[PDB]
Ligand binder design. Sequence first.
Ligand SMILES: NS(=O)(=O)c1cc2c(cc1C(F)(F)F)NCNS2(=O)=O
Ligand SMILES: NS(=O)(=O)c1cc2c(cc1C(F)(F)F)NCNS2(=O)=O
Ligand SMILES: N[C@@H](CCC(=O)O)C(=O)O
Ligand SMILES: N[C@@H](CCC(=O)O)C(=O)O
Ligand SMILES: [Zn+2]
Ligand SMILES: [Zn+2]
Lengths: 258, 258
Amino acid sequence: KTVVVTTILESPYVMMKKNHEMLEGNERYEGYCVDLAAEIAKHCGFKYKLTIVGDGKYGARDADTKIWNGMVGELVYGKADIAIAPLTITLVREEVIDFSKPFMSLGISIMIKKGTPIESAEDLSKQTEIAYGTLDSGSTKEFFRRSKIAVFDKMWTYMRSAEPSVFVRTTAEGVARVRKSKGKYAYLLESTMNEYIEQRKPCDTMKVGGNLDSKGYGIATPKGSSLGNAVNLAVLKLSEQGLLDKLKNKWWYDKGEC
Amino acid sequence: KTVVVTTILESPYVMMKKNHEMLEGNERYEGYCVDLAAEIAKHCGFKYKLTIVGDGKYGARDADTKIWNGMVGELVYGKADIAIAPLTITLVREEVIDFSKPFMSLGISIMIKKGTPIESAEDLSKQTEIAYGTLDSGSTKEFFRRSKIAVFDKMWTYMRSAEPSVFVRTTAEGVARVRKSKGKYAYLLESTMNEYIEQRKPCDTMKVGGNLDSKGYGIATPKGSSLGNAVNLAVLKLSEQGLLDKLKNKWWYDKGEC
Ligand SMILES: NS(=O)(=O)c1cc2c(cc1C(F)(F)F)NCNS2(=O)=O
Ligand SMILES: NS(=O)(=O)c1cc2c(cc1C(F)(F)F)NCNS2(=O)=O
Ligand SMILES: N[C@@H](CCC(=O)O)C(=O)O
Ligand SMILES: N[C@@H](CCC(=O)O)C(=O)O
Ligand SMILES: [Zn+2]
Ligand SMILES: [Zn+2]
């Protein structure tokens, strides 16, 4: 049986090839997670089909309906066999899906327009002239929503009631807001995405400060699935052989435009 | 039933208190892993006894008999219920024991005596005046034994046949060897330990270069043990609540001497 792989259009994990229109199936896409999916499938010995998550989200549980959206939803409701994406390992997710050991490290970080008078979270929290927000329906939003650290609770208290909304529906949208806001909008996003954008034209953004936390992305499967074991062993093998490091260099730095 | 916890004396994860010989049971010890064990046991609701691993090793498989030693061996052969220690998650171990998601990140790194003319692993591999080695029966030695990377493979070739031996039986031994060899010995060890030592008197060593790889420590349990599920969830909870970052600050940096 062909394994259905849910993923998400997010640079440089999964992007449309410049000629995707004249290609078919898996060949339409390129990126870090496309390269990783191929290796995983090869070492686990399965055929697969890449599919982009329909609502374009990572996955959160609606407080009202209790329904999971995003890639997590696709796994929970049986629409996909595996997720290969920059999907953060979290407790609430681990409760309904299985994750491999992490294939990539990251932390919440701050993206500013170059020259913006900000050095850290504490700095953002102490002021009001510069707006700031996070992706919607992602692990970053939940981190702020749940935090008990004073600086972070204060940041959440501002963000949840700021108007107009400080939250964006896509990473691309957050970056665009930073670029067009003349230094008046800072964007809280994962260090991996932050680092990738830092190396792309127009070269007008930068990551500042340390990471606010430390965690990892994992390959996700439906709870109890028979795939989980093999996939986890494959990720460990690829980690030790240095493939993950090679892939990061290929898609983040070898490509650098700044 | 009281959970038997295997662990290892390795600063600052598990250390003997100065109060010591006059204390009993778990009270005799302090450190990051002593504190971790306490929070894990609280969240999973078990009582536990800390026991130092008999042979003082992390764990590797004798290539001849295929018998496991160290903390890995204690789990594999039913002598301990759980290992709470700076135990590296690796492919060969995952085949015989279960690991939680990582509670701490690290990479292999180089420790030198201050002033030693060495900037990197490449530097080390290009010369012979400075000897270098790793801990026995650990994941670092295995990393080099298995590595296909040109620098590391060449390093292994030198290490595996150098005389007198460049390998050491404990981390303490590795560090003291560096400190007393007048710059003629470099020690390859995990960045967490290296960074800890760099901040302790006599303040004569230094971590140089980036990490050679990226990985993590996990809490380990016997294959299929029922404890594993609860333990893993406890670690994710502790991660998200910030307790892990708190612990590291307490034991690495709050304690700094240099
Ligand atoms: N340092 S980490 O927590 O992000 C990590 C952990 C493990 C990996 C790989 C990574 C990293 F590449 F993301 F850096 N490999 C498999 N075993 S692991 O210890 O969980
Ligand atoms: N970056 S990491 O690979 O070492 C890591 C991963 C996860 C953690 C914590 C860490 C770190 F603190 F060691 F940094 N928390 C639980 N989930 S995780 O993604 O596996
Ligand atoms: N990687 C995150 C999405 C990005 C973010 O929340 O900043 C997740 O899995 O939800
Ligand atoms: N953390 C290592 C021990 C120290 C080392 O190998 O450098 C292990 O679990 O084997
Ligand atoms: Zn708690
Ligand atoms: Zn033997």
